Write a protein that binds this ligand. Structure first.
Ligand SMILES: [Zn+2]
Lengths: 263, 338, 158, 96
RNA sequence: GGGG
DNA sequence: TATAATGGGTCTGATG
DNA sequence: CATCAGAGCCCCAAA
């Protein structure tokens, strides 16, 4: 075939075709399976030993792997590969935490509190203290993974007009806008079926946005408004330190009916 | 531990396409596109729906979701029903399913194989409001556009067409998500224009241009007033935590103790007037002045609550006020209340 | 504003708890702007960093996951297996909760393959569709690195 | 600050001083009526211009800000009675 | 950057 | 919407 | 032997 009709190699008589001087050869750990009539699997499908490929049930797959239906060759390639379920990110962790029968893990950790060696009794205790922490409270481990991120009421992160008519805004808004952009762009990238390398890069950035909002600077570089090296004031920063909420507003306030002067 | 260096490494895993495999993938993609048109004619289904189900199977069971634009939710149940309605076709039709599949898989490798082009474009839009990565992901969005619009029969190299959509998608993000106060993308163009214009002037004047000099260069329809107003709305907000600057901003909304005091002493010294009047007198005033609904009802609407017309209401009102005016200068309470 | 909807349809305390139909705003004390929470529904889940980086990590120790292993899975550097499905890597079958690098994931999920460029014009020593042993010569200056079906790419001469 | 017509800071150490004196009510008034108890601080003023003894304080608004900033961190803070039944310090303005 |  | 463009710019103490 | 969290109070004018 070709761009335009001319330069199309049209067979002039009856003959047979040979192929020479390939641009490059591509070796492939797969298993060819030629067929005659209609193939029942389509390219992309996963298959294990036994599954029925083509010709109404005759030709079957020996190995394990991935369907690559050729039509130029009339063969059904099966690329050897398992239908493995490995994941990345908090989606994996949230699943494992969901799959934790805490009562079981308490039995097995206690059943290891009887070992010698010092270090083994010690670590079974540090874990059992976390397990028991969840059993006594009623909290589920999978709650340490966020699905719905909460949003602080607006008047606690205000956007107010100052004297000069200019606007002064809390830092939390730019850490929220950061997250909402990365979340929305991820919802759009998913619907548009983007490649893996793109989605994972977006999921990483979504994590890194959640972590700048809850505790900016803890992991990785602190996010900063452009043209100023000031780290944005995350939620953690607001709560803690000498300038934090507890010490600066709960254990000590400013007060009315008071004055000072020289003695 | 460094997101940029991590993504730069992953991108280097996928080898760059040869002019052949560039044309081959672009070709298989366009054929798969047509194979879903011709496949919606046969099956009599929605094209978009079909192309999504083709994606579901090529990508894997990891992704499965309701694609807003489509009409039937995409749960493993309805994709299996449409994957069977597809497999239900004669060899001559069922061949188009293998085409669409082969296309969606080629589309993927074509996107992945061009992620390097997007990096070296976004590297130049650094520090315009968005982070390097935020620029890359925005550029990768135009690359997904360039792949579904690339006509390979024009004999252009793919990089020449993608560069347009990539710039288009980055330049849009900067204009859409870089301001805490979102500005319409056309107004951003004008604000930038005033900026490039003012800098031009400053560089041939040895000083900063006044508003007049800018309105002159901006052209027709531009006076100094609109230059000033355009800058007023082009002002980005300042941080409350700027070393804190927020500590010096008094809250004006919530009323102070003195205000809450006087407002709760005005109502007290006013329902001292709902008595001395009556029940209907001290109610026409509530509708007219808006004590009940918040809005001032004319002597017209008020006429539909007592039966009276627009001139017994007036005497009903003026009898109240004139009586209340005599209750002043005898109690002399309400004077200072200003 | 205290007791008033956005578009000003309702603007008084004769309307308390009513939600305007034009704008959708409740009429109540504007003090609630300090008390009313909102939320963001995430596309995929994200880990609350306090439970990741507060050492010893409460999620890490709960799952017997080292600090490094939690960073790698959470910040997309290694996969963690939730179901091997009979997969095997370099011989040993894939045990669940095992960490795979991106290469070990592709090898198990997509198969292995390699492509070798031939010099321009230099023709092959094998042909299209035939089995090959590792170390088997494919062309004058090209030898294969692994076993499997060999495939031509773009024959220049038919 | 004097330029803002400010109040004086009754910091940590000054609270310790009132605790050491056992001046419980003087301290409570410092942490509510004379600062950020919006309800009590408005009610106090109206009692003093009227000649009535100050009212008993309510909840400091700076504690509500603490509760809400913990909800923003996915942490559920609960004010309970002695029967471990939740007590609303938002007076129903935060629930649906 | 000062005061105590 | 189409030349081609493809990897960045101190100071101490507690705990794993 | 590495990583993280601590490191006095109140007040002024400035920004
Ligand atoms: Zn309304």
């Amino acid at each position: 075939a070709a761009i335009d009709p001319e330069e199309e190699v049209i067979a002039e008589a009856e003959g047979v075709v040979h192929l020479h001087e390939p641009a490059s050869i591509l070796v492939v750990k797969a298993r060819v399976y030629p067929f005659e009539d209609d193939v029942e699997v389509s390219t992309g499908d996963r298959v294990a030993p036994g599954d029925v490929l083509a010709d109404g049930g005759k030709v079957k797959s020996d190995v394990y792997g991935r369907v690559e239906v050729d039509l130029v060759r009339n063969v059904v390639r099966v690329v050897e590969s398992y239908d493995i379920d490995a994941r990345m990110g908090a989606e994996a962790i949230q699943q494992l935490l969901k799959e934790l029968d805490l009562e079981a893990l308490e039995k097995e950790l206690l059943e290891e509190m009887k070992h010698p060696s010092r270090a083994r009794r010690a670590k079974a205790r540090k874990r059992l203290e976390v397990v028991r922490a969840f059993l006594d409270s009623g909290n589920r481990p999978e709650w340490m993974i966020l699905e719905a991120v909460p949003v602080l009421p607006p008047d606690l992160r205000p956007m107010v007009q100052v004297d000069g008519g200019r606007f002064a805004t809390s830092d939390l808004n730019d850490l929220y806008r950061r997250l909402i952009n990365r979340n929305n762009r991820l919802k759009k990238l998913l619907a548009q079926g983007a490649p893996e390398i793109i989605i994972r890069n977006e999921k990483r950035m979504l994590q890194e946005a959640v972590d700048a909002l809850l505790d900016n600077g803890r992991r990785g570089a602190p996010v900063t408004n452009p043209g100023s090296d000031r780290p944005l004031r995350s939620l953690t920063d607001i709560l803690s330190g000498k300038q934090g909420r507890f010490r600066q507003n709960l254990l000590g306030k400013r007060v009315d009916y008071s004055g000072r002067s020289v003695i | 531990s460094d997101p940029v260096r991590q993504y730069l490494h992953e991108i280097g895993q996928v080898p760059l396409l040869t002019l052949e495999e560039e044309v081959e993938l672009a070709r298989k993609v366009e054929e798969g596109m047509e194979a879903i048109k011709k496949l919606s004619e046969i099956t009599g289904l929605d094209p978009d729906l079909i192309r999504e189900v083709v994606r579901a199977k090529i990508l894997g069971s990891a992704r499965v979701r309701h694609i807003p634009g489509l009409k039937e939710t995409l749960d493993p149940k309805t994709v299996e029903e449409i994957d069977q309605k597809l497999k239900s076709l004669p060899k001559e039709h069922k061949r188009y399913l293998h085409i669409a599949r082969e296309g969606e898989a080629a589309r993927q490798h074509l996107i992945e194989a061009n992620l390097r082009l997007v990096v070296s474009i976004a590297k130049k839009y650094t520090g315009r409001g968005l982070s390097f990565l935020d620029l890359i992901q925005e550029g990768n969005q135009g690359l997904i556009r360039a792949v579904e619009k690339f006509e390979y029969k024009r004999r252009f190299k793919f990089s020449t067409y993608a560069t347009w959509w990539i710039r288009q998608a980055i330049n849009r993000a900067i204009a859409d998500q870089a301001r805490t106060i979102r500005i319409p993308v056309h107004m951003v163009e004008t604000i930038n224009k005033l900026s490039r214009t003012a800098r031009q002037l400053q560089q041939e004047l040895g000083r900063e241009p006044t508003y007049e000099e800018i309105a002159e260069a901006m052209g027709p329809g531009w006076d100094a007033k609109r230059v000033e107003e355009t800058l007023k709305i082009a002002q980005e907000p300042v941080s409350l935590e700027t070393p804190f600057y927020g500590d010096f901003i008094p809250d004006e909304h919530l009323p102070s103790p003195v205000d809450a005091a006087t407002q709760s002493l005005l109502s007290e010294e006013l329902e001292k007037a709902l008595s001395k009047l009556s029940e209907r007198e001290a109610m026409v005033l509530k509708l007219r002045k808006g004590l009940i609904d918040g809005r001032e009802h004319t002597l017209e609407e008020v006429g539909a609550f007592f039966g009276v017309t627009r001139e017994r209401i007036r005497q009903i009102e003026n009898k109240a006020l004139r009586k209340l005016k005599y209750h002043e200068s005898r109690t002399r309470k309400l004077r200072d209340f200003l | 504003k205290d007791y008033e909807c956005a578009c000003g349809k309702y603007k008084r305390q004769r309307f308390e708890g009513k939600v305007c139909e034009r704008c959708g705003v409740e009429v109540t004390k504007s003090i609630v702007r300090r008390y009313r929470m909102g939320h963001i529904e995430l596309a995929t889940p994200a880990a609350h960093i306090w439970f990741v980086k507060d050492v010893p990590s409460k999620i890490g120790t709960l799952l017997d996951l080292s600090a490094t292993e939690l960073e790698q899975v959470l910040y997309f550097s290694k996969y963690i297996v939730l179901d091997p499905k009979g997969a095997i890597l370099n011989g040993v079958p894939v045990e669940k909760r095992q960490l795979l690098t991106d290469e070990e994931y592709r090898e198990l999920r997509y198969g292995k393959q390699e492509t070798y460029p031939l010099p321009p014009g230099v023709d092959a020593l094998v042909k299209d569709g035939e089995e090959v042993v590792k170390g088997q010569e494919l062309a004058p200056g090209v030898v294969s690195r692994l076993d499997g079906v060999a495939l031509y790419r773009f024959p220049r001469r038919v | 600050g004097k330029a803002q017509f400010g109040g004086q800071r009754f910091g940590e150490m000054e609270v310790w001083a009132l605790e050491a004196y056992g001046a419980a009510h003087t301290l409570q008034e410092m942490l509510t009526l004379k600062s950020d108890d919006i309800e009590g601080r408005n009610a106090a003023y109206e009692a003093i211009i009227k000649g009535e003894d100050v009212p008993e304080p309510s909840v400091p608004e700076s504690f509500r800000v603490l509760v809400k900033e913990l909800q923003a961190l996915a942490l559920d803070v609960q004010t309970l009675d002695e029967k471990d039944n939740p007590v609303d310090i938002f007076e129903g303005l935060a629930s649906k």
